[PDB]
RNA sequence: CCGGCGUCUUUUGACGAACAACUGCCCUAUCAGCUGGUGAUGGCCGUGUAGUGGACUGCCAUGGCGUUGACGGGAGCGGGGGAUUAGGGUUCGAUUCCGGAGAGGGAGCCUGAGAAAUAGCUACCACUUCUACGGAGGGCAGCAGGCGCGCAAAUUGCCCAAU
RNA sequence: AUCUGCGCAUGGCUCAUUACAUCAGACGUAAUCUGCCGCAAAAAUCUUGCGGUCCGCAAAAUUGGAUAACUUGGCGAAACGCCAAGCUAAUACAUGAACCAACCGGGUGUCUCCAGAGACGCCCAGCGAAUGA
């Protein structure tokens, strides 16, 4: 039973500096994976500067002031990951955890109507006791009576206030996804062709808005809308478009010279 | 009219001091459904394993009673699917396959003949001779050395 | 203690394995139950996860199923008749899985008079007996030992694992298999 | 050999040290725990107690 | 009336555990046969396990490994990596991260979801401390230190302010 | 101060063991256990009160016994050693909830009908587990 993380064995997307202490806050089991989450001490202290250390950081959390998906989370080690909605009523800001196109976690600011729904991907389907078919989700939810057209690769729109699955997005050819793993993580694209290969990993071929073709495993894609215009959720400021490394290097030198 | 006339003992398969039966299905049903009964006569359990492997003519219409068999048991084929050539068939219902490969040495820019031998459980659906090329699928441990189980035999 | 590892087994080359750890608790085994006939005495065993595994010592009764009729009846074990592992386990009358036992046969006859109405007259209103009994027939080797008093049967549960002596009645070629080995 | 005598109808346990000469008459290799013995074996000032 | 908790059971995601093994690995033939009665390779009922399984009882078969270096002996944790390097390489990796193993040697357990735990228990062996002789204890490959050993490695320090 | 609930299986040290072992990349667990944590689930159980000797009328079920700390007396040279008695808690231990309060199913005896159909009665019908179909 591990209870510690070393700050070197912590994920790189958290961006904790190696010289500040040996340890990182090991996220508890919960909704999201340990490799694939951002625990609430890092959001309150390192992302947002509401807390200067971990001692000011539990003055916020243990008091019941941060809400992940409409419910107050008093754990600094609670795993918040992809598509979660983090509200704070006192400062009046609410955010969504999305991946930006460089693969890192990004806090997308939200309205009040956009902060009620979240988008969740089915990971398993089974029948529970009774004859109730429940749907297992990447965020750990077990929706008991989902839309009967739910398959495993699909996306359920959820509305975390009134816990009612308001919508369904099937996983087909004509849909748009966001990639949540691999080298292509954070990129958004239309689906082109899904190569099955039964017994092994499904490969999904994807085309971007510019036309850049790229592939991933189909367990890494997360469908978020009917097309790239009609996305069901708002995405970070690049909107899944990965610029060239040369062109994005030129633009920062131009912006820094034009600023002085 | 009250008497049923059940099936007689098939001594060709019954050799083994306990009665050889399949645990999946009951042999003794009076009005057995069309679920598991095969073409000619008797009740049989046959299963379709995964990866586009066609079950043989035996294991559906055969008479043998095999546990540890991928087509007629709870043995599931999963993980690795490999190929080898049959080396020895001297064991009872088990063959040893030989996997011959070239090992490249990065220093001396030249390959090197190596081999791995695997004990593979062989169903009575199959009779492979030495030199036959087989396709094996990984299963659970079935003995001290058996992890694989033959799925298809390619003759000669 | 008792271990279930391959550290003591020789390699397939015949080489000895040199041991560089202590025994783990996660690789243990325990002493066998050796369940016999007798009045019921069980001892639970604390397994992994805190689950309980009920050792059966001295069992005398179980739920035996008659699979053509898809019913079961709690009957009393009489004798241990044939065991495929050893004839020495018959003599000490050990209950294991798949050993052949004789059971009481009285609830099976009484059920066969209550259902199908055949003895080995009182509800004249309900002859749903006639709705059955026409298509169905009963194997002769069952009906002989059913009225003889004891029925040969096969244990289908693991008593040292579950603390139960459940079973099935021998039918078909399986009964005719074991009748030849006895007599 | 000291002796704690308790009277649980009132509590109030007190201690009374038994002499050598009062114990030399008792064979003492009987009288294990649980026995309801006559009290006068612990000196004859404890006459008639159990 | 309403709201924060706290708890049985049941169920599943998560953090894990345990097992299995696809490819890979220093030198040695002045080490050519290894295994199999007392499990060695396999098969049949069981048993045992958290589970698979010669893991194990009974029975049957006669196998399995090896000059493509088995078997036995010597060196010693394995990687990420370091040093040097035109290219090909040649070396080092006790050491911060990951994994494995151990707590004086060797066992055996209890409890618990998880230990064959050692700042837990039981026993023996080797050392060992207190005793009013009746008895009772020890386990620094934790951090400071101590004596030895060596060519060879620090303070019996301050503090939870940060991690 | 002590009961109780979690924790002490992590961390930290060291590298003695160790070559179909460990370990790396890659797979498997459909062969399995899994506290804490996340989202869920939940209709089993003739219990109380009062009166009468098994029944009646009632209903926010006002359940029961024991131990620590403590006191008393202490044993012992001591011991991260101990004894006996007297008190008293629970989210410890044990016991236990009718009707409100469902649907659905099986097996089965009398009663109105027709030349098999309905009503009523009885036994059984919860999650998990075993075996059989
Ligand atoms: N060789 C390991 C295995 O031991 C088994 O048999 C072993 C047992 O019969 C027996 O082992 C016993 C053991 O039962 C018993 N419970 C404990 C005892 N210490 C062991 O004894 C063995 O170990 C000790 C120390 O090494 C030796 O002194 C002793 O001579 C040796 N026979 O001796 C045999 C080993 O020499 C099987 N033969 C086989 O599985 C395999 O040989
Ligand atoms: Mg090396
Ligand atoms: Mg077996
Ligand atoms: Mg380490
Ligand atoms: Mg020694
Ligand atoms: Mg030190
Ligand atoms: Mg306690």
Coordinates of C-alpha atoms in Angstrom, one line a residue, chain B residues 37 75 120 144 148:
Chain B
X37 CA -27.0 -30.9 -29.2
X75 CA -10.3 -22.6 -21.2
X120 CA 1.6 -26.8 -25.8
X144 CA 3.8 -26.9 -14.8
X148 CA -0.4 -22.3 -24.7

